[PDB]
Amino acid sequence: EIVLTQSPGTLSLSPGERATLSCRASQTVSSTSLAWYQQKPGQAPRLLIYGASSRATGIPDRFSGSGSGTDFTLTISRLEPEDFAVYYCQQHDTSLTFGGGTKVEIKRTVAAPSVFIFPPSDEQLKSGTASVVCLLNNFYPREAKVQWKVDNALQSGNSQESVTEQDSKDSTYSLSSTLTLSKADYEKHKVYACEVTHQGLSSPVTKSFNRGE
Amino acid sequence: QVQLVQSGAEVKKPGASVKVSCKASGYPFTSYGISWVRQAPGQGLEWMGWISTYNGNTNYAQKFQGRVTMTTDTSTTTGYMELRRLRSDDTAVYYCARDYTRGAWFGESLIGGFDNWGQGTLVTVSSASTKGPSVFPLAPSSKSTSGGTAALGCLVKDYFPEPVTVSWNSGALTSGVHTFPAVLQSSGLYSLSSVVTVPSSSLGTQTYICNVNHKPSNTKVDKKVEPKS
Numbered sequence: 214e215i216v217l218t219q220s221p222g223t224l225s226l227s228p229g230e231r232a233t234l235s236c237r238a239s240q241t242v243s244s245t246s247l248a249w250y251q252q253k254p255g256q257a258p259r260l261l262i263y264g265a266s267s268r269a270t271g272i273p274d275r276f277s278g279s280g281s282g283t284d285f286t287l288t289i290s291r292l293e294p295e296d297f298a299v300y301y302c303q304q305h306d307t308s309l310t311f312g313g314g315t316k317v318e319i320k321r322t323v324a325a326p327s328v329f330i331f332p333p334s335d336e337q338l339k340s341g342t343a344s345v346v347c348l349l350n351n352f353y354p355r356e357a358k359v360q361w362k363v364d365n366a367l368q369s370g371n372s373q374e375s376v377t378e379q380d381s382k383d384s385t386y387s388l389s390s391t392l393t394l395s396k397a398d399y400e401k402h403k404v405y406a407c408e409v410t411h412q413g414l415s416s417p418v419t420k421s422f423n424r425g426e
Numbered sequence: 427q428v429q430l431v432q433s434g435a436e437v438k439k440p441g442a443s444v445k446v447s448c449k450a451s452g453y454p455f456t457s458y459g460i461s462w463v464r465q466a467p468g469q470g471l472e473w474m475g476w477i478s479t480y481n482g483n484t485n486y487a488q489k490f491q492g493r494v495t496m497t498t499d500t501s502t503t504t505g506y507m508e509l510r511r512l513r514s515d516d517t518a519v520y521y522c523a524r525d526y527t528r529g530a531w532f533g534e535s536l537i538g539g540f541d542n543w544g545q546g547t548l549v550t551v552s553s554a555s556t557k558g559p560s561v562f563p564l565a566p567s568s569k570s571t572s573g574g575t576a577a578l579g580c581l582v583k584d585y586f587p588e589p590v591t592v593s594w595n596s597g598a599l600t601s602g603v604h605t606f607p608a609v610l611q612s613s614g615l616y617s618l619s620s621v622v623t624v625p626s627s628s629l630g631t632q633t634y635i636c637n638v639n640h641k642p643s644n645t646k647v648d649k650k651v652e653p654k655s
């Protein structure tokens with residue numbers, strides 16, 4: 214098979230700049246059999262470029278493809294707000310293979326997260342389960358670090374986090390890490406804290422609460 | 427003219443099968459092939475196979491050979507895709523598209539791609555059964571106060587399957603609300619949280635309540651989030 218590798222996995226550019234998306238192939242791919250696709254969030258993919266360089270019907274002139282052999286490049290001359298999506302390259306020279314995809318992210322000024330922590334409700338404690346939630350609200354870039362510390366002991370393998378999509382208004386991200394423990398294990402300790410490390414923070418922020426207070 | 431309407435969402439047990447339909451219209455149906463692509467939640471596109479609407483020849487991907495069977499009904503201009511022996515990692519959105527990469531008559535290589543796509547079919551494979559969500563309040567306090575802003579939310583925990591809709595004050599509080607994508611717990615049940623930032627001055631006077639709706643279990647929960655002491 215012919216493996217298509219797209220780099221980078223995420224491209225962070227501000228609206229208005231020119232975007233260049235690469236699609237390297239493991240073998241020489243015929244120029245007439247390489248296609249580019251766009252997938253907006255929550256929609257089906259849409260054919261952008263066909264035959265490496267020819268654009269499909271209804272595609273703006275800012276989209277253009279180039280390259281031959283193993284190196285191919287999709288170019289967006291001016292990034293529009295609707296142009297921020299994921300782009301896949303596809304070849305059918307030998308069988309058929311899609312690329313890894315390249316998410317074009319809106320590049321924003323660095324924004325520090327507003328860290329909040331929520332103790333497990335007594336309604337949930339009555340069911341023999343305690344869930345502690347650490348909230349990271351509105352931050353850029355997406356990369357962050359959340360560590361759960363229970364009585365200074367680092368927690369690992371017992372928490373799940375979730376990140377929202379890039380906000381359509383301020384182009385920011387939000388994270389929600391949920392530490393799940395049994396009611397018995399929850400009542401064995403006192404201090405519950407999540408340490409948040411981000412680029413917008415000069416030092417990692419720690420929001421804590423003592424159980425029973 | 428060209429439209430591709432797919433069948434509704436499916437929820438199947440591991441080991442079972444699922445058949446997805448692809449109703450085509452607006453173009454000579456037997457002149458174009460039909461390709462099928464699936465997309466796991468969060469992952470990229472994955473080609474499944476190609477079928478000629480003329481002779482019926484199929485070219486499946488090696489990953490799905492033996493489990494997938496694509497058929498077309500020329501009398502109804504409908505393409506089908508059956509995937510048997512479903513496993514948990516088969517949970518994905520299955521798309522169908524009008525193919526212009528291989529000739530439907532002679533199998534020649536074409537200068538084109540997948541022009542028109544379908545709306546997609548979400549197939550969820552899990553051994554879990556339908557269960558209503560337990561809504562717990564994320565009560566605010568001084569720990570959830572960054573300046574004058576306070577944060578409070580709801581914990582939609584332990585439910586199956588997707589989705590759930592969360593609104594605040596019957597949908598009147600939308601600005602500053604973040605409903606996070608659900609995480610799949612080890613128990614097979616989903617769980618998410620929906621938070622909202624509000625001024626700390628309004629914690630004592632205002633009333634905040636989340637409206638959690640889960641249609642598969644017919645569960646409607648209105649949990650009031652109050653600041654605890």
Ligand SMILES: COCCO[C@@H](C)CO[C@@H](C)CO[C@H](C)CO[C@H](C)CO[C@@H](C)CO[C@@H](C)CO[C@H](C)CO[C@H](C)COC[C@@H](C)N
Binds near residue numbers: 453479480503531
């Ligand atoms: C809007 O939807 C239209 C769907 O097509 C309808 C007309 C219904 O057609 C379906 C039933 C097609 O079912 C079988 C694939 C049709 O097979 C019959 C035997 C072929 O039809 C004959 C009457 C003519 O078919 C031409 C019109 C299309 O066939 C293409 C050209 C294949 O060409 C063969 C392989 C070689 O042609 C010889 C060439 C040198 N003249």
